[PDB]
Every structure is written in C-alpha cells, then in structure tokens.
Design a protein around this ligand. Structure first.
Ligand SMILES: Nc1ncnc2c1ncn2[C@@H]1O[C@H](COP(=O)(O)O)[C@@H](OP(=O)(O)O)[C@H]1O
Ligand SMILES: O=[N+]([O-])c1cc(N[C@@H]2CCN(Cc3ccccc3)C2)ccc1CO
Length: 252
C-alpha cells in the first residue's frame, strides 16, 4: 500500500484488562504506527513520574465543568501517544472515546481462568503466596514502591466500578472480569469496537484500522507469566535492570 502521514494522536483505545495480550498489542500498534502506545510498562520503564498523576485523576474520577479539568489532564498524560492499552487507562475507555471521537476501540479477551492464573502470577498474587515477596523484591530494583501498587489496585477498582475489592478473592475477580468485558461490549457501538482473542494475530486488527499487514513481521507474543517470572528472578539476582535488559529484548 501507499505510505500516508498519520496524525500523532490517540487512534486506538484498547479496553482490554491486564493479562489479555496488552503488551503484544502495544508492540503491534507501535509496529503499525511508528509512534508510542501507552501501557503500564510505559509507566514502569519510562514515566514513573506519571504514577501520581494517574492516582490524582482516579481520585477525582467520580465527578460539566469538573469533567473539563479531568479530560484536559487525560489528554496531557497521553500527549504524543497513538494508542492506549492496559491499566491505568483501560477503565477510562468511555472518557477516552469522548476526548478522541475519531479513535477506534479494541477489547482483548481470553479464557477467564487462564486470565486469573496469569494475573495471580504477575500482577496480584494472593497475600499468603510466597511468590509475592519475590515480586516485591524485584520491583524495588526498579524503584517501584507502595504507590505503584496503590495505582494498580485503584485503577482496577476504577475499571471494575467498585469502592473496594477483596483482592484475595478469586470469585470476586472472576465476576468482575466477566462483568467488565460484558459491559464494554454493551457500551461501545459495534461499528467502533473490535474484540480480539489471543491468537487472532494481525489480520482482523489491520482490517479494522485500514492498514496493511506489516511485511515480514510476525504478530508479537511477549509478556508470558513464565517470562515475567524470569524477569523478577533476574532482577533479584543481578540487582539492576541495566545488567539484564539485553536479555529481554521485545518485552522491555
Ligand atoms: N500472540 C500471543 N499469542 C498467545 N498468547 C499471548 C500472545 N501475546 C501475549 N499472550 C499472552 O497474554 C498474556 C500477557 O498479557 P498482558 O501483556 O496483557 O499482560 C500472557 O499470558 P500468560 O501469562 O498466560 O502466558 C501471554 O502469554
Ligand atoms: O497494574 N497492572 O495491571 C500491572 C501491574 C504490574 N505490577 C507487577 C507486580 C510485580 N511486578 C512484576 C513486573 C512486571 C513487569 C515489569 C517489571 C516487574 C510488577 C505489572 C503489570 C501490570 C499490567 O501490565
């Protein structure tokens, strides 16, 4: 196809929850658009100063005049990006649709038990799981503190529309996952929504976005819980990111 000059603004809003292929989708959108896509890894690795900003925005999110200040801060946080994925953004999908009326919406989904298992290995181990201590030890190497965990918790509560949440309760998390995915599909006009399942690859995505399939580039497969376990163990072993980063090429 011909090469055209794409606008550096949010063109794709992905409402998918963490551990549904968000990092592979981020990578895929960056391959298509050649500009950055937001993700929790953007915060962790490039913009830890954004943590307090997302926390403030969530704090005010329950609240039109008030909306304009909030929408202005969302636009500010996303300046220079061509798409959003992952927490903390995904709970804001309805507001992002208003701010970027010409953006299209994605929802990444998967088997709920595979999702929960992945979530418990990477994002939200149970309180009494010994792996939680290793996760926390590796995170300190990256400069992540209790405010990072607060942002994860609060952005999940915001996405699930809950005042509080028993994070150690699998049944609660599974119900919230199903309800969240059902609500996205009931909210977004079908013309504006593409549901992606793990394994779908390039073709439905590129058709929805009116772009060619990237020539000679396989659809990304990154950020498996096995890979995250290795990342945590290697951070613990070497005590820095820069000592190990060459071992995690497309994930980091
Ligand atoms: N192209 C692909 N095909 C199959 N699974 C993929 C994939 N890309 C990512 N995944 C899976 O999506 C999960 C990561 O999602 P996210 O990037 O949103 O955290 C991981 O699940 P597992 O933890 O079950 O391996 C990973 O294996
Ligand atoms: O809020 N999330 O959804 C969310 C939270 C985390 N936190 C986890 C807890 C343990 N630590 C492991 C690690 C994962 C990746 C990079 C470095 C370290 C971070 C990670 C991802 C997401 C979504 O991509």
């Amino acid at each position: 196809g011909a090469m055209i000059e794409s606008s550096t603004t949010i063109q794709v809003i992905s409402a998918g929850l963490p551990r549904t292929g968000t990092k592979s989708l981020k990578n895929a959108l960056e391959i298509i658009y050649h500009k950055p896509c937001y993700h929790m890894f953007e915060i962790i690795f490039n913009k830890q100063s954004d943590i307090i900003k997302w926390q403030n925005l969530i704090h005010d999110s329950h609240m039109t005049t008030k909306t304009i200040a909030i929408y202005d801060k969302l636009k500010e946080l996303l300046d220079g990006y061509i798409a959003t994925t992952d927490l903390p953004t995904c709970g804001f999908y309805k507001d992002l649709m208003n701010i970027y009326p010409n953006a299209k919406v994605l929802l990444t989904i998967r088997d709920k038990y595979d999702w929960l298992h992945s979530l418990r290995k990477v994002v939200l181990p149970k309180s009494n799981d010994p792996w939680k201590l290793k996760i926390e030890e590796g995170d300190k190497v990256l400069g992540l503190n209790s405010d990072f965990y607060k942002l994860t918790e609060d952005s999940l509560k915001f996405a699930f529309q809950k005042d509080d949440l028993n994070f150690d309760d699998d049944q609660v998390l599974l119900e919230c996952y199903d309800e969240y995915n059902r609500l996205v599909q009931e909210t977004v006009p079908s013309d504006r929504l593409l549901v992606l399942r793990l394994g779908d690859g390039w073709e439905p995505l590129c058709k929805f976005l009116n772009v060619e399939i990237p020539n000679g580039i396989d659809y990304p497969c990154v950020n498996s819980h096995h890979q995250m376990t290795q990342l945590t163990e290697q951070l613990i072993k070497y005590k820095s990111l820069d000592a190990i980063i060459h071992m995690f090429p497309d994930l980091i």
